[PDB]
Design a protein around this nucleic acid. Structure first.
Ligand code: DTP
Lengths: 540, 403
DNA sequence: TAATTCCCCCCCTTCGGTGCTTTGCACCGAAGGGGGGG
């Protein structure tokens, strides 16, 4: 290709790699010999002599289409010693962000990296040795004249070169949409099929003038188009078929693969849940360790299989309509959402199950889900959608007016989906008249890990319990728990703990600590609770 | 060109580009196409390893988009403020001036080329909607707006331009920060506008503040004719917290009134000793804390607290419990349900005040979740500078003690 | 051990660093696994 090379240098004070080639299978050696002979015929690699002291191990893998080998170089040392690059690939295109096009073509550039020349001064660092069949003769030594597969600079250089090659054609054809992901090209237009094919041939000729071939084997002309892991139809898109493993006994690696596949499926299949399956991966050590299902991962797996049984599709973006994201709660800090423009015509689906913080409530998790959906929607469509949330306007108003943080949700409306989001208790702003007043105290020593937790009541009642392996914070939480347990429906509580008061004032409904969970249950059980903080031992 | 250099031991900015809305991306693409047409920026490849985030804003009552580059990492590097004379020693009369107008003069920076060896540090990437194409990388060929070194390099030309104006009007204090000129006069507001028009025409041929109304926010104890145990407990906590700001605060009698377990609603009469102590603490709180001086070496920290009902409090300090300034930003609600917009406006106002008073933007401790801020702050930002900020993940200890 | 590569986005778990202080506890980012793309 006549494209100008990108100048590349090593990191300062660094030399080229000198890693010895490891032994290779005779099949791999034969495949590499054939590939290297073909490449040297085409000038993609050049024979080198003793003047080159560098070496890097090479190997081969199988391509997606078998009977063809991909030649890779273990450039880890060279990658360590290579200058840093800035990646221009900022993300992954999504079919939901595609607009409807009358005519569509998917093109792939052949031998992509090997069609882009490499900087000459860097070429000596790409030296490698193709070992001899079985052994005997010393191997043939080559160096790369093009972008090698396995070098950390090849993807960015190829992407920039492809952008430079494509820019004149896109300038001359502003009405043609071209999604370029590395070498994969999606070309959409509103032209007639004959005019579209003429434009496609023009684009192929333009690419060929730059040394980029577009072989017919990967030239797709009819729907459905296999693009970027999706199947694209004229009016809908789906994911390429997802095969969930069906194993009698599961290992850690199997569970990880299943969770990843379910996460991938959740972008268009609504209701995917992975929490119970992800919990199986907590505390495990060996990837081959057999993990039995916990009868909660069994139900989750059955539900996910039921969801995947029916085929679902997404629709294409219509910029003249409105984006609407609807959120539903699923329990245990899990949320699903659907982004659509017409009812029951999903552009996209997704889930949010991140557990941020030791103590949270449903409102904070809903806000986090809204933030995630907003960022994803800005990425895909360039705008934020209107939200349909299962939270009352009054509940959100109370929360964000009484909360000490700056919280906001973009333009949204309430949807009465039965699992509504609400705060399960409220702390009184003023002490309750006539309610019993508890003064709680929890102390612990840092040496013996022993402490006490108790309360004194203005009516004369008092109690104190000892605690072992408990810190001061745990003792204060225990003292508040004691006050909650021994009180009536209404209670005033005075604590010296800023930590416990700060935890409780956030109004959590779930926590990673069982003590906080018990406190939350007691608080929900109560009718009126006032929490007061007193500074220190100065006075009760 | 001035041979700008990075700080010794520093590498260069490598900050990723955050996603942008479609209108922002279109505005950025148009602006960058125009800038590349006139040689202000040039396209670069991925072999440049540096990057700074970029976005677009719409100024106050302006229909034109302005490109903004987040040069905060590069500004933390780039010791250029000494090699080229930094912005003149901060005038102390700007804070005492009557009317201060902020003018955008960053466009002039585009008239002076940037040192070639430094250009690679000004790299930025325009993103694409739905990742249709790889991000388009540019680097600056001229002095960029938002970089700390641009005013330092342009200071010679700035003084040359302003000299015919400063000599004619010696009563006007002109300060320069980033792309902004803060020009202050004690004249009448109509004469101030006329003189501003003359200065604008001077700049062409070559937003008003009021620092006099900036009032401190003292901590005030509540006044009651009958104090309950809860009220005395809250007062004692407030005074115990204030004792770290005002040495000499006594709570002995008030704490003596809080011995023996009693109902929070119970009304306890105040003893004469407690009453005197409360009066003495109130008059101690009335006078401002003495012994706090701005140290130009140390950095400014601005803490913000949300008080509800569209009210925020802030404290600018260099050492804990030693406040250089305390204030309250009130939006009085008024069809303003957006907490993030209010916090962004408060941050901009506090930064403007800090620039006017000490010549430095403070480091903000924002009372917001990080993701919410990074998602929404660019939608309401109007300033051409960006202060450093961090996010507090714990409820403030002060709470209502700053009211 | 046995197979050894690169770049991008995502999720879920683990672990170490940071900050305030009640030297424990909460939060966050990077790296490991997985998914997907080329
Ligand atoms: N496993 C991989 N390791 C390293 N680089 C890869 C890998 N897969 C793809 N790439 C890079 C290098 C390829 O030249 C480029 C495009 O991928 P791909 O289309 O699969 O291959 P190709 O262009 O070399 O082959 P083909 O001619 O068969 O299309 O992306």
């Amino acid at each position: 290709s006549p494209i100008e090379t990108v100048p590349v240098k090593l990191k300062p004070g660094m030399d080229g790699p000198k890693v010895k080639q490891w032994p290779l299978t005779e099949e791999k050696i034969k495949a590499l010999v054939e590939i290297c002979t073909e490449m040297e015929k085409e000038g993609k690699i050049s024979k080198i002599g003793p003047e080159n002291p560098y070496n890097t191990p090479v190997f081969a893998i199988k391509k997606k289409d078998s009977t063809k080998w991909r030649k890779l170089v273990d450039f880890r040392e060279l990658n360590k010693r290579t200058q840093d690059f800035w990646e221009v690939q900022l993300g992954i295109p999504h079919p939901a962000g595609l607009k409807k096009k009358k005519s569509v073509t998917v093109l792939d550039v052949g031998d992509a990296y090997f069609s882009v020349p490499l900087d000459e001064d860097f070429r000596k660092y790409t030296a490698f040795t193709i070992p001899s069949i079985n052994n005997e003769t010393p191997g043939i030594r080559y160096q790369y004249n093009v972008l090698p597969q396995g070098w950390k600079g090849s993807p960015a250089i190829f992407q920039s070169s492809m952008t430079k090659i494509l820019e004149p054609f896109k300038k001359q054809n502003p009405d043609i949409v071209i999604y370029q992901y590395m070498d994969d090209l999606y070309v959409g237009s509103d032209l007639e099929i004959g005019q579209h094919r003429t434009k496609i041939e023009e684009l192929r000729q333009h690419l060929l003038r730059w040394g980029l071939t577009t072989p017919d084997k990967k030239h797709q002309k009819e729907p459905p188009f296999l693009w970027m892991g999706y199947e694209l139809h004229p009016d809908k898109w789906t994911v390429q078929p997802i095969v969930l493993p069906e194993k009698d006994s599961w290992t850690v690696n199997d569970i990880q693969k299943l969770v990843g596949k379910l996460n991938w499926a959740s972008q268009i299949y609504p209701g995917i849940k992975v929490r119970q399956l992800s919990k199986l991966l907590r505390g495990t050590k060996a990837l081959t360790e057999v993990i039995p299902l916990t009868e909660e991962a069994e139900l989750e797996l059955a539900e996910n299989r039921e969801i995947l049984k029916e085929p679902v599709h997404g629709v294409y973006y219509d910029p003249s309509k409105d984006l609407i994201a609807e959120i539903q709660k699923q329990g245990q800090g899990q949320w699903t959402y659907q982004i659509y423009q017409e009812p029951f015509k999903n552009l996209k689906t997704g889930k949010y199950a991140r557990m941020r913080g030791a103590h949270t409530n449903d409102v904070k998790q809903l806000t986090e889900a809204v933030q995630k959906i907003t960022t994803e929607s800005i990425v895909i469509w360039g705008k934020t959608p209107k939200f349909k949330l299962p939270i009352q306007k009054e509940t959100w108003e109370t929360w964000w007016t009484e909360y000490w943080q700056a919280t906001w949700i973009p333009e949204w409306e309430f949807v009465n989906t039965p699992p509504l989001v609400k705060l399960w208790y409220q702390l009184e702003k003023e002490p309750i008249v006539g309610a019993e007043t508890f003064y709680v105290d929890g102390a612990a020593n840092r040496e013996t890990k022993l402490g006490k937790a108790g309360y004194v009541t203005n009516k004369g009642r008092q109690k104190v319990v000892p605690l072992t392996n408990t810190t001061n914070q745990k003792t204060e939480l225990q003292a508040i728990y004691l006050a909650l347990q021994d009180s009536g429906l209404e209670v005033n509580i005075v604590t010296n703990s800023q930590y416990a008061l700060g935890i409780i004032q956030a109004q959590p409904d779930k926590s990673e600590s069982e003590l906080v969970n018990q406190i939350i249950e007691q608080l929900i059980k109560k009718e009126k609770v006032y929490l007061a903080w007193v500074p220190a031992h100065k006075g009760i | 060109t001035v041979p700008v250099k990075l700080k010794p031991g520093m590498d260069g900015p490598k900050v990723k580009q955050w996603p942008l809305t479609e209108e922002k991306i279109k505005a950025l693409v148009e602006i960058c196409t125009e800038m590349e047409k006139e040689g202000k920026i040039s396209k670069i490849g991925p072999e440049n390893p540096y990057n700074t985030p970029v976005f677009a804003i719409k100024k106050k009552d302006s229909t034109k988009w302005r490109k903004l580059v987040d040069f905060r990492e590069l500004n933390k590097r780039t010791q250029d403020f000494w090699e080229v004379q930094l912005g003149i020693p901060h005038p102390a009369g700007l804070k005492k001036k009557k009317s201060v107008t902020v003018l955008d003069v960053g466009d002039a920076y585009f008239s002076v080329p940037l040192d070639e060896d430094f250009r690679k540090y000004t790299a930025f990437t325009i993103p694409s909607i739905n990742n249709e194409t790889p991000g388009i990388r540019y680097q600056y060929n001229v002095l960029p707006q938002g970089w700390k070194g641009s005013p330092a390099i342009f200071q010679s030309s700035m003084t040359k331009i302003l000299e015919p104006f400063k000599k004619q009007n010696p009563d006007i204090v002109i300060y320069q920060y980033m792309d902004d000129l803060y020009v202050g006069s004690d004249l009448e507001i109509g004469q101030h506008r006329t003189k501003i028009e003359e200065l604008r025409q001077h700049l062409l041929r070559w937003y008003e503040l009021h620092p006099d109304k900036w009032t401190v926010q003292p901590i005030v104890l509540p006044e009651k004719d009958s104090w309950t145990v809860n009220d005395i407990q809250k007062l004692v906590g407030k005074l115990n917290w204030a004792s770290q700001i005002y040495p000499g605060i006594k709570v002995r009698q008030l704490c003596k009134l809080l011995r023996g377990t009693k109902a929070l609603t119970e009304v306890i009469p105040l003893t004469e000793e407690a009453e005197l102590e409360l009066a003495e603490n109130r008059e101690i709180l009335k006078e401002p804390v003495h012994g706090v001086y701005y140290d130009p070496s140390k950095d400014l920290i601005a803490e913000i607290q949300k008080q509800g009902q569209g009210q925020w409090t802030y404290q600018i300090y260099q050492e804990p419990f030693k406040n250089l300034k305390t204030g309250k930003y009130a939006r009085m609600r008024g069809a303003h349900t957006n907490d993030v917009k209010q916090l962004t406006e408060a941050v901009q106002k506090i930064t403007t005040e800090s620039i006017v008073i000490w010549g430095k933007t403070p480091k903000f401790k924002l009372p917001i979740q990080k993701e919410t801020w990074e998602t929404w702050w660019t939608e309401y930002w109007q300033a051409t500078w960006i202060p450093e900020w961090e996010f507090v993940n714990t409820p403030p200890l002060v709470k209502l003690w700053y009211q």
